[PDB]
Short mmCIF file of C-alpha atoms and ligand atoms in Angstrom, two decimals:
data_model
loop_
_atom_site.label_atom_id
_atom_site.label_comp_id
_atom_site.label_asym_id
_atom_site.label_seq_id
_atom_site.Cartn_x
_atom_site.Cartn_y
_atom_site.Cartn_z
CA UNK A 58 -53.60 -3.88 47.58
CA UNK A 59 -54.90 -0.77 45.84
CA UNK A 60 -52.57 2.24 45.86
CA UNK A 61 -53.81 5.53 47.27
CA UNK A 62 -51.85 7.49 44.67
CA UNK A 63 -49.61 6.83 41.69
CA UNK A 64 -47.53 9.20 39.58
CA UNK A 65 -46.69 7.75 36.19
CA UNK A 66 -44.73 8.44 33.02
CA UNK A 67 -42.22 10.80 34.58
CA UNK A 68 -38.53 10.80 35.42
CA UNK A 69 -37.52 10.22 39.02
CA UNK A 70 -34.81 12.28 40.69
CA UNK A 71 -34.84 10.60 44.10
CA UNK A 72 -32.60 13.00 46.00
CA UNK A 73 -29.59 10.67 46.20
CA UNK A 74 -27.76 12.47 43.41
CA UNK A 75 -28.15 9.45 41.14
CA UNK A 76 -29.06 10.09 37.48
CA UNK A 77 -32.75 10.70 36.78
CA UNK A 78 -34.57 7.50 35.81
CA UNK A 79 -37.81 6.64 34.02
CA UNK A 80 -40.07 5.08 36.66
CA UNK A 81 -43.48 5.41 38.32
CA UNK A 82 -44.10 6.21 41.99
CA UNK A 83 -46.74 4.47 44.09
CA UNK A 84 -48.17 5.74 47.37
CA UNK A 85 -50.14 4.00 50.11
CA UNK A 86 -50.94 4.98 53.69
CA UNK A 87 -48.92 8.17 53.30
CA UNK A 88 -45.74 6.33 52.35
CA UNK A 89 -43.95 5.44 49.13
CA UNK A 90 -45.28 1.93 48.57
CA UNK A 91 -43.44 1.14 45.34
CA UNK A 92 -41.29 2.46 42.51
CA UNK A 93 -41.11 1.04 39.00
CA UNK A 94 -43.78 0.05 36.47
CA UNK A 95 -47.23 0.93 37.82
CA UNK A 96 -49.14 1.64 34.62
CA UNK A 97 -51.62 -1.19 35.18
CA UNK A 98 -51.60 -0.99 38.98
CA UNK A 99 -54.97 0.27 40.34
CA UNK A 100 -54.90 3.49 42.37
CA UNK A 101 -57.44 5.82 44.00
CA UNK A 102 -55.71 8.87 42.52
CA UNK A 103 -53.26 9.18 39.65
CA UNK A 104 -51.11 11.86 38.04
CA UNK A 105 -49.56 11.82 34.57
CA UNK A 106 -45.99 13.05 35.02
CA UNK A 107 -45.05 12.58 31.37
CA UNK A 108 -42.35 15.12 30.52
CA UNK A 109 -41.87 16.00 34.19
CA UNK A 110 -39.51 15.29 37.07
CA UNK A 111 -40.83 13.48 40.15
CA UNK A 112 -38.74 14.39 43.18
CA UNK A 113 -38.88 14.44 46.98
CA UNK A 114 -40.77 17.47 48.28
CA UNK A 115 -38.45 20.39 48.98
CA UNK A 116 -37.34 21.08 52.54
CA UNK A 117 -37.15 24.77 53.43
CA UNK A 118 -34.51 24.81 56.15
CA UNK A 119 -34.90 28.52 56.86
CA UNK A 120 -38.47 29.47 57.58
CA UNK A 121 -39.99 32.06 59.90
CA UNK A 122 -43.49 30.64 59.48
CA UNK A 123 -43.69 29.70 63.18
CA UNK A 124 -47.08 31.32 63.76
CA UNK A 125 -48.50 31.03 60.24
CA UNK A 126 -49.98 27.58 60.80
CA UNK A 127 -52.61 29.34 62.90
CA UNK A 128 -52.59 32.80 61.29
CA UNK A 129 -52.46 31.97 57.55
CA UNK A 130 -52.99 28.16 57.36
CA UNK A 131 -52.91 27.91 53.54
CA UNK A 132 -49.10 28.14 53.39
CA UNK A 133 -49.56 28.61 49.63
CA UNK A 134 -46.26 30.51 49.42
CA UNK A 135 -44.60 27.19 50.32
CA UNK A 136 -46.63 24.64 48.38
CA UNK A 137 -46.64 26.69 45.17
CA UNK A 138 -42.85 26.44 45.01
CA UNK A 139 -42.71 22.74 45.86
CA UNK A 140 -41.98 22.88 49.60
CA UNK A 141 -43.35 20.02 51.72
CA UNK A 142 -41.41 20.58 54.97
CA UNK A 143 -40.25 23.73 56.71
CA UNK A 144 -37.86 24.26 59.60
CA UNK A 145 -39.10 27.19 61.69
CA UNK A 146 -37.71 29.05 64.70
CA UNK A 147 -34.69 30.56 63.00
CA UNK A 148 -32.39 33.48 63.80
CA UNK A 149 -33.03 33.27 67.52
CA UNK A 150 -36.80 33.78 67.34
CA UNK A 151 -39.39 31.02 67.68
CA UNK A 152 -43.02 30.28 68.53
CA UNK A 153 -41.95 29.24 72.03
CA UNK A 154 -41.09 29.67 74.83
CA UNK A 155 -42.97 32.88 75.59
CA UNK A 156 -41.00 35.89 76.88
CA UNK A 157 -41.43 37.19 80.41
CA UNK A 158 -44.12 39.90 80.63
CA UNK A 159 -42.67 43.15 79.33
CA UNK A 160 -39.71 41.50 77.61
CA UNK A 161 -39.63 42.05 73.87
CA UNK A 162 -37.34 42.19 70.86
CA UNK A 163 -37.62 43.93 67.49
CA UNK A 164 -36.64 40.67 65.77
CA UNK A 165 -39.80 39.04 67.13
CA UNK A 166 -41.55 40.97 64.35
CA UNK A 167 -40.08 38.38 61.99
CA UNK A 168 -42.75 36.04 63.40
CA UNK A 169 -46.03 37.94 63.61
CA UNK A 170 -48.61 39.27 66.09
CA UNK A 171 -49.96 35.97 67.45
CA UNK A 172 -49.11 35.68 71.16
CA UNK A 173 -46.24 33.23 71.61
CA UNK A 174 -46.76 29.76 73.09
CA UNK A 175 -45.75 28.92 76.66
CA UNK A 176 -43.38 26.13 75.58
CA UNK A 177 -42.69 23.69 72.76
CA UNK A 178 -45.11 21.11 74.15
CA UNK A 179 -47.90 23.70 73.92
CA UNK A 180 -46.83 24.74 70.42
CA UNK A 181 -46.67 21.15 69.18
CA UNK A 182 -49.97 20.36 70.88
CA UNK A 183 -51.55 23.23 68.94
CA UNK A 184 -50.10 21.89 65.70
CA UNK A 185 -51.33 18.34 66.38
CA UNK A 186 -54.85 19.71 66.93
CA UNK A 187 -54.77 21.93 63.84
CA UNK A 188 -52.50 20.03 61.45
CA UNK A 189 -50.26 22.21 59.23
CA UNK A 190 -50.49 22.19 55.42
CA UNK A 191 -46.89 20.99 55.23
CA UNK A 192 -44.53 19.23 57.64
CA UNK A 193 -43.06 21.30 60.45
CA UNK A 194 -39.77 20.92 62.31
CA UNK A 195 -38.94 23.49 64.97
CA UNK A 196 -35.88 25.11 66.50
CA UNK A 197 -36.07 26.97 69.81
CA UNK A 198 -34.83 30.55 69.63
CA UNK A 199 -31.98 31.79 71.79
CA UNK A 200 -33.73 35.17 71.92
CA UNK A 201 -36.79 33.40 73.34
CA UNK A 202 -34.62 31.64 75.90
CA UNK A 203 -33.08 34.91 77.08
CA UNK A 204 -36.41 36.76 77.10
CA UNK A 205 -38.03 33.92 79.03
CA UNK A 206 -35.26 33.39 81.58
CA UNK A 207 -33.91 36.88 82.20
CA UNK A 208 -35.62 39.68 84.12
CA UNK A 209 -33.10 41.93 82.36
CA UNK A 210 -32.33 40.36 78.95
CA UNK A 211 -29.67 43.01 78.31
CA UNK A 212 -27.36 41.82 81.09
CA UNK A 213 -24.93 38.94 81.50
CA UNK A 214 -26.73 35.82 82.74
CA UNK A 215 -26.29 34.66 86.32
CA UNK A 216 -25.34 31.02 86.81
CA UNK A 217 -28.98 30.28 87.60
CA UNK A 218 -30.27 32.07 84.49
CA UNK A 219 -27.74 30.26 82.30
CA UNK A 220 -28.92 26.97 83.76
CA UNK A 221 -32.54 28.03 83.27
CA UNK A 222 -31.93 28.63 79.58
CA UNK A 223 -30.19 25.27 79.29
CA UNK A 224 -33.07 23.53 81.08
CA UNK A 225 -35.58 25.28 78.83
CA UNK A 226 -33.58 24.14 75.82
CA UNK A 227 -33.39 20.60 77.19
CA UNK A 228 -37.16 20.53 77.65
CA UNK A 229 -37.65 21.79 74.10
CA UNK A 230 -35.35 19.12 72.69
CA UNK A 231 -37.06 16.43 74.75
CA UNK A 232 -40.35 17.70 73.29
CA UNK A 233 -39.04 17.23 69.76
CA UNK A 234 -37.28 20.46 68.76
CA UNK A 235 -34.46 19.86 66.28
CA UNK A 236 -32.07 22.26 68.00
CA UNK A 237 -31.71 25.93 68.87
CA UNK A 238 -31.02 28.99 66.75
CA UNK A 239 -29.14 32.20 67.47
CA UNK A 240 -29.58 35.71 66.09
CA UNK A 241 -26.28 37.24 67.16
CA UNK A 242 -26.84 40.31 64.99
CA UNK A 243 -30.00 41.08 66.98
CA UNK A 244 -30.95 42.04 70.51
CA UNK A 245 -30.90 40.42 72.98
CA UNK A 246 -28.83 37.57 71.55
CA UNK A 247 -25.97 39.92 70.67
CA UNK A 248 -25.30 40.38 74.39
CA UNK A 249 -24.36 36.70 74.76
CA UNK A 250 -20.72 35.68 75.17
CA UNK A 251 -18.95 32.41 74.35
CA UNK A 252 -19.73 30.66 77.66
CA UNK A 253 -23.48 31.24 77.27
CA UNK A 254 -23.66 29.93 73.71
CA UNK A 255 -21.35 27.00 74.45
CA UNK A 256 -23.55 25.99 77.37
CA UNK A 257 -26.56 25.70 75.09
CA UNK A 258 -24.44 23.97 72.44
CA UNK A 259 -23.39 21.30 74.95
CA UNK A 260 -27.04 20.56 75.68
CA UNK A 261 -27.80 20.27 71.96
CA UNK A 262 -24.65 18.29 71.15
CA UNK A 263 -25.38 15.72 73.88
CA UNK A 264 -28.69 14.96 72.16
CA UNK A 265 -27.29 15.17 68.63
CA UNK A 266 -29.29 18.33 67.95
CA UNK A 267 -28.37 21.47 66.02
CA UNK A 268 -27.18 25.01 66.54
CA UNK A 269 -28.29 27.08 63.54
CA UNK A 270 -27.06 30.65 63.46
CA UNK A 271 -27.76 34.05 62.00
CA UNK A 272 -24.20 35.13 62.82
CA UNK A 273 -23.07 38.26 64.67
CA UNK A 274 -22.26 40.32 61.59
CA UNK A 275 -22.54 39.64 57.87
CA UNK A 276 -20.59 42.64 56.61
CA UNK A 277 -17.20 43.94 57.80
CA UNK A 278 -17.07 41.36 60.57
CA UNK A 279 -18.36 38.37 58.61
CA UNK A 280 -15.14 36.35 58.86
CA UNK A 281 -14.96 36.84 62.62
CA UNK A 282 -18.67 35.99 62.88
CA UNK A 283 -18.28 32.66 61.11
CA UNK A 284 -15.19 31.85 63.19
CA UNK A 285 -17.20 32.58 66.34
CA UNK A 286 -19.86 29.95 65.63
CA UNK A 287 -17.33 27.44 64.30
CA UNK A 288 -15.34 27.79 67.52
CA UNK A 289 -18.48 26.84 69.43
CA UNK A 290 -18.92 23.81 67.20
CA UNK A 291 -15.30 22.69 67.45
CA UNK A 292 -15.29 23.02 71.22
CA UNK A 293 -18.62 21.29 71.89
CA UNK A 294 -18.94 19.04 68.85
CA UNK A 295 -22.39 20.49 68.22
CA UNK A 296 -23.63 20.14 64.64
CA UNK A 297 -23.77 23.67 63.19
CA UNK A 298 -25.62 25.45 60.39
CA UNK A 299 -24.65 28.92 59.15
CA UNK A 300 -27.95 30.55 58.17
CA UNK A 301 -28.41 32.54 54.96
CA UNK A 302 -24.67 32.86 54.44
CA UNK A 303 -23.72 36.05 52.64
CA UNK A 304 -21.28 38.95 52.44
CA UNK A 305 -22.94 42.38 52.60
CA UNK A 306 -21.55 45.62 51.14
CA UNK A 307 -19.02 45.93 48.26
CA UNK A 308 -15.94 46.07 50.48
CA UNK A 309 -16.84 42.60 51.73
CA UNK A 310 -17.72 40.94 48.44
CA UNK A 311 -15.61 37.83 47.95
CA UNK A 312 -14.92 37.15 51.61
CA UNK A 313 -16.91 33.92 51.39
CA UNK A 314 -13.75 32.36 50.00
CA UNK A 315 -12.32 32.80 53.49
CA UNK A 316 -15.46 31.85 55.42
CA UNK A 317 -16.07 28.74 53.34
CA UNK A 318 -12.41 27.79 53.77
CA UNK A 319 -12.90 28.07 57.53
CA UNK A 320 -16.07 25.99 57.29
CA UNK A 321 -14.14 23.39 55.31
CA UNK A 322 -11.39 23.25 57.94
CA UNK A 323 -14.03 22.62 60.60
CA UNK A 324 -15.83 19.83 58.75
CA UNK A 325 -12.51 18.21 57.84
CA UNK A 326 -11.91 18.00 61.60
CA UNK A 327 -15.16 16.11 62.11
CA UNK A 328 -17.52 18.93 63.07
CA UNK A 329 -20.82 18.66 61.22
CA UNK A 330 -21.21 22.02 59.52
CA UNK A 331 -23.66 23.05 56.83
CA UNK A 332 -25.17 26.28 55.53
CA UNK A 333 -27.98 27.66 53.42
CA UNK A 334 -28.81 30.55 51.11
CA UNK A 335 -31.73 32.09 49.25
CA UNK A 336 -31.03 32.93 45.56
CA UNK A 337 -31.08 36.74 45.78
CA UNK A 338 -28.47 39.51 46.24
CA UNK A 339 -30.61 41.45 48.71
CA UNK A 340 -31.47 40.68 52.33
CA UNK A 341 -34.60 41.58 54.28
CA UNK A 342 -35.20 42.12 57.98
CA UNK A 343 -36.09 44.84 60.45
CA UNK A 344 -35.27 48.43 59.51
CA UNK A 345 -31.94 49.40 61.07
CA UNK A 346 -31.34 53.18 61.25
CA UNK A 347 -27.59 52.62 61.59
CA UNK A 348 -27.59 51.45 57.95
CA UNK A 349 -29.29 54.61 56.65
CA UNK A 350 -25.97 56.07 55.49
CA UNK A 351 -24.11 52.84 54.68
CA UNK A 352 -26.47 51.12 52.23
CA UNK A 353 -28.32 52.82 49.38
CA UNK A 354 -31.78 51.90 48.10
CA UNK A 355 -33.05 50.66 51.45
CA UNK A 356 -36.64 49.78 50.51
CA UNK A 357 -39.41 49.53 53.09
CA UNK A 358 -41.26 46.21 53.41
CA UNK A 359 -43.61 47.35 56.19
CA UNK A 360 -44.00 50.12 58.78
CA UNK A 361 -46.46 50.22 61.65
CA UNK A 362 -46.62 54.02 61.98
CA UNK A 363 -46.30 54.66 58.23
CA UNK A 364 -47.90 51.74 56.34
CA UNK A 365 -48.16 53.98 53.27
CA UNK A 366 -44.37 53.75 52.94
CA UNK A 367 -44.18 50.05 52.07
CA UNK A 368 -42.38 49.73 48.74
CA UNK A 369 -40.71 53.13 49.01
CA UNK A 370 -37.00 54.01 49.22
CA UNK A 371 -35.74 55.44 52.51
CA UNK A 372 -34.01 58.26 50.61
CA UNK A 373 -37.26 59.26 48.88
CA UNK A 374 -39.17 59.21 52.16
CA UNK A 375 -36.52 61.34 53.87
CA UNK A 376 -36.43 63.83 51.00
CA UNK A 377 -40.21 64.15 51.08
CA UNK A 378 -40.24 64.75 54.84
CA UNK A 379 -37.32 67.16 54.70
CA UNK A 380 -35.16 65.23 57.17
CA UNK A 381 -32.10 62.97 56.93
CA UNK A 382 -32.40 59.23 56.31
CA UNK A 383 -31.48 58.17 59.84
CA UNK A 384 -34.23 60.40 61.22
CA UNK A 385 -36.72 59.07 58.68
CA UNK A 386 -35.77 55.49 59.59
CA UNK A 387 -36.42 56.25 63.25
CA UNK A 388 -39.83 57.75 62.44
CA UNK A 389 -40.72 54.64 60.43
CA UNK A 390 -40.02 52.32 63.36
CA UNK A 391 -41.05 49.66 63.85
CA UNK A 392 -40.50 48.69 60.23
CA UNK A 393 -38.77 46.29 57.87
CA UNK A 394 -36.68 46.72 54.74
CA UNK A 395 -34.81 45.07 51.89
CA UNK A 396 -31.07 45.68 51.69
CA UNK A 397 -29.60 45.33 48.20
CA UNK A 398 -26.04 44.67 49.33
CA UNK A 399 -24.71 41.38 47.97
CA UNK A 400 -22.95 40.18 44.81
CA UNK A 401 -25.07 37.66 42.92
CA UNK A 402 -21.95 35.90 41.65
CA UNK A 403 -20.93 35.30 45.26
CA UNK A 404 -24.40 34.08 46.25
CA UNK A 405 -24.03 31.55 43.45
CA UNK A 406 -20.56 30.45 44.58
CA UNK A 407 -21.79 29.95 48.13
CA UNK A 408 -24.68 27.84 46.87
CA UNK A 409 -22.17 25.64 45.05
CA UNK A 410 -20.54 24.69 48.34
CA UNK A 411 -21.16 20.94 48.96
CA UNK A 412 -22.96 21.57 52.25
CA UNK A 413 -25.20 24.41 51.10
CA UNK A 414 -28.95 23.87 51.37
CA UNK A 415 -31.75 26.23 50.30
CA UNK A 416 -33.54 28.38 52.87
CA UNK A 417 -36.20 30.83 51.69
CA UNK A 418 -36.17 33.08 54.77
CA UNK A 419 -39.61 34.27 53.72
CA UNK A 420 -41.26 36.87 55.95
CA UNK A 421 -45.01 36.04 55.48
CA UNK A 422 -46.46 39.00 57.39
CA UNK A 423 -44.61 41.77 55.52
CA UNK A 424 -46.88 44.11 53.53
CA UNK A 425 -44.42 44.17 50.62
CA UNK A 426 -42.17 41.14 51.27
CA UNK A 427 -38.90 40.18 49.66
CA UNK A 428 -39.85 37.82 46.75
CA UNK A 429 -37.81 34.99 48.29
CA UNK A 430 -41.01 34.28 50.23
CA UNK A 431 -42.64 32.91 47.07
CA UNK A 432 -39.82 32.10 44.67
CA UNK A 433 -36.69 30.79 46.38
CA UNK A 434 -36.80 27.11 45.41
CA UNK A 435 -38.06 27.59 41.87
CA UNK A 436 -35.57 30.42 41.32
CA UNK A 437 -32.79 27.98 42.19
CA UNK A 438 -34.17 25.40 39.74
CA UNK A 439 -34.77 27.91 36.97
CA UNK A 440 -32.09 30.59 37.38
CA UNK A 441 -29.25 28.77 39.14
CA UNK A 442 -29.68 25.35 37.57
CA UNK A 443 -31.34 25.63 34.15
CA UNK A 444 -30.03 29.10 33.29
CA UNK A 445 -26.63 29.32 35.01
CA UNK A 446 -25.85 25.58 35.06
CA UNK A 447 -24.22 25.91 38.49
CA UNK A 448 -24.89 22.20 39.09
CA UNK A 449 -27.11 19.48 37.65
CA UNK A 450 -30.78 19.18 38.48
CA UNK A 451 -29.98 15.93 40.30
CA UNK A 452 -27.40 17.71 42.45
CA UNK A 453 -29.72 20.65 43.15
CA UNK A 454 -32.62 18.42 44.18
CA UNK A 455 -30.27 16.68 46.61
CA UNK A 456 -29.49 20.06 48.22
CA UNK A 457 -33.22 20.63 48.71
CA UNK A 458 -34.11 17.18 50.00
CA UNK A 459 -31.60 14.56 51.12
CA UNK A 460 -29.03 17.03 52.46
CA UNK A 461 -31.57 18.85 54.66
CA UNK A 462 -32.91 15.50 55.91
CA UNK A 463 -29.35 14.44 56.76
CA UNK A 464 -28.46 17.72 58.47
CA UNK A 465 -31.68 18.00 60.48
CA UNK A 466 -32.15 14.30 61.16
CA UNK A 467 -35.37 13.64 59.27
CA UNK A 468 -35.79 9.89 59.05
CA UNK A 469 -37.81 8.57 56.11
CA UNK A 470 -37.93 11.96 54.39
CA UNK A 471 -36.00 13.81 51.70
CA UNK A 472 -35.65 10.78 49.43
CA UNK A 473 -37.88 8.85 47.06
CA UNK A 474 -37.42 5.25 48.22
CA UNK A 475 -39.93 2.61 49.33
CA UNK A 476 -40.99 3.10 52.94
CA UNK A 477 -40.24 6.81 53.16
CA UNK A 478 -42.99 9.38 53.67
CA UNK A 479 -44.69 10.41 50.44
CA UNK A 480 -43.63 14.07 50.35
CA UNK A 481 -43.43 14.56 46.58
CA UNK A 482 -43.18 17.36 44.04
CA UNK A 483 -43.76 16.98 40.31
CA UNK A 484 -42.34 19.72 38.10
CA UNK A 485 -41.41 20.54 34.52
CA UNK A 486 -37.60 20.92 34.47
CA UNK A 487 -37.72 23.14 31.39
CA UNK A 488 -40.28 25.65 32.66
CA UNK A 489 -39.98 25.55 36.45
CA UNK A 490 -39.21 29.05 37.68
CA UNK A 491 -40.06 31.80 40.12
CA UNK A 492 -42.36 34.64 39.08
CA UNK A 493 -42.22 36.69 42.27
CA UNK A 494 -40.47 39.99 41.64
CA UNK A 495 -39.40 42.91 43.81
CA UNK A 496 -42.51 44.85 42.70
CA UNK A 497 -44.84 41.84 42.79
CA UNK A 498 -43.33 39.56 45.47
CA UNK A 499 -46.34 37.27 45.81
CA UNK A 500 -46.61 35.97 42.24
CA UNK A 501 -46.71 32.17 42.20
CA UNK A 502 -44.10 30.00 40.51
CA UNK A 503 -44.69 28.22 37.22
CA UNK A 504 -43.67 24.68 36.35
CA UNK A 505 -44.87 23.04 39.56
CA UNK A 506 -47.43 20.43 38.50
CA UNK A 507 -48.30 18.87 41.84
CA UNK A 508 -47.29 18.43 45.46
CA UNK A 509 -48.01 15.64 47.92
CA UNK A 510 -47.44 15.91 51.66
CA UNK A 511 -47.47 12.50 53.33
CA UNK A 512 -49.27 11.14 50.28
CA UNK A 513 -52.01 13.78 50.24
CA UNK A 514 -52.34 16.45 47.55
CA UNK A 515 -51.79 20.01 48.78
CA UNK A 516 -51.09 21.54 45.36
CA UNK A 517 -52.67 22.52 43.04
CA UNK A 518 -55.77 21.65 45.06
CA UNK A 519 -55.33 21.88 48.85
CA UNK A 520 -57.36 19.60 51.16
CA UNK A 521 -60.88 20.71 52.06
CA UNK A 522 -60.79 19.59 55.70
CA UNK A 523 -57.85 18.41 57.78
CA UNK A 524 -54.39 19.10 56.38
CA UNK A 525 -51.70 16.37 55.91
CA UNK A 526 -48.68 18.03 57.52
CA UNK A 527 -47.00 16.44 60.52
CA UNK A 528 -45.01 17.85 63.42
CA UNK A 529 -41.55 16.38 62.93
CA UNK A 530 -40.62 15.60 66.53
CA UNK A 531 -36.92 14.81 66.87
ZN1 ZN B 642 -31.55 35.68 60.00
#
């Protein structure tokens, strides 16, 4: 039977960690139909991967693209760096459920302006009707749960409200969500205590779903923050993921030796724990005035009242206005910024941890976004692998494909084997690299030759009509 697609002459890195091998890949009906010698096998479409690596499409485990499938459907920032699947709904904020009227959170800005969906069924229904460019898996945000269940999201939950959040989570999981996420460093999630988080974790654990977490603090209290989420995992048995693990500010550089040691103690005990990072020593999120005098070079990524300030340093803005930085930060609100506060050598060491995946944490609606939006995966392949030799290409690809599939429960994805979905990326190992910079954060990567999502090409030429992405219902 004729193949729908075939990629020949290249070297296959299947995601299992096994050594790259010279073989061709055949696709039919959206799945990998065969692997081996296909030179003379007829196919509707064919790519010459000579001198290239053929690997499973990359899985971005830390996306905030929840509302982009409707707002900016091209998702070019993902496809251009080899991403074929994204896990959205991170750091406590998700597309659904919708908050109670009048309930809001600054962190919701990490998603966009599109009105949130009533519930996961509605969100997934919207995605089925308007298929995404790439595959989409979704987490339900703890912030959403609180904002949807509590008349006063700043208080302690009543027994009924706690049960309401658990029931909302249960419904989301039954609908296909892969778990729930927390944003303990943000309001209103920060108000939550152990009992509240454990309750949700029990619901997730019972269904073998995840608890991903943007921990309480990633600076002076980073060790306590990691211990807090590990305690929840050890007590409930809920699989856990520590989002964009890092140590902010010089006095905290190196503390990942302690946090990773704690993570290791937890996984040795049987708790499923993983983590992820983006390959940059600067973070990016909402502008926090309390950091005005603790971190230098705070650079604005967006500002509703002062859009002219995107790309500018808080200190320069303050000096120009004749006020202090904290005051300037308050006048810029609501806004976002980049915080250059990590040690690149530490980011690299964290990535080397056996359970570390890659999460771009791109913020698609920012006027002047952090470059991780467009160059995370290719920066790992070019800077961390080819340049720094932190691990082999085979090992790195595994971190971007098979490991995420294992952690998030994606059957028939993340590996190049017959029968699995044909999410594939073809790239030149010697040239693959990010081009997005701090000044020009939207420059596309180089070295990515082609990308297939469920057997259909999305890069370099995206589909004219319906897109090939699927909602990955757990
Ligand atoms: Zn986060």
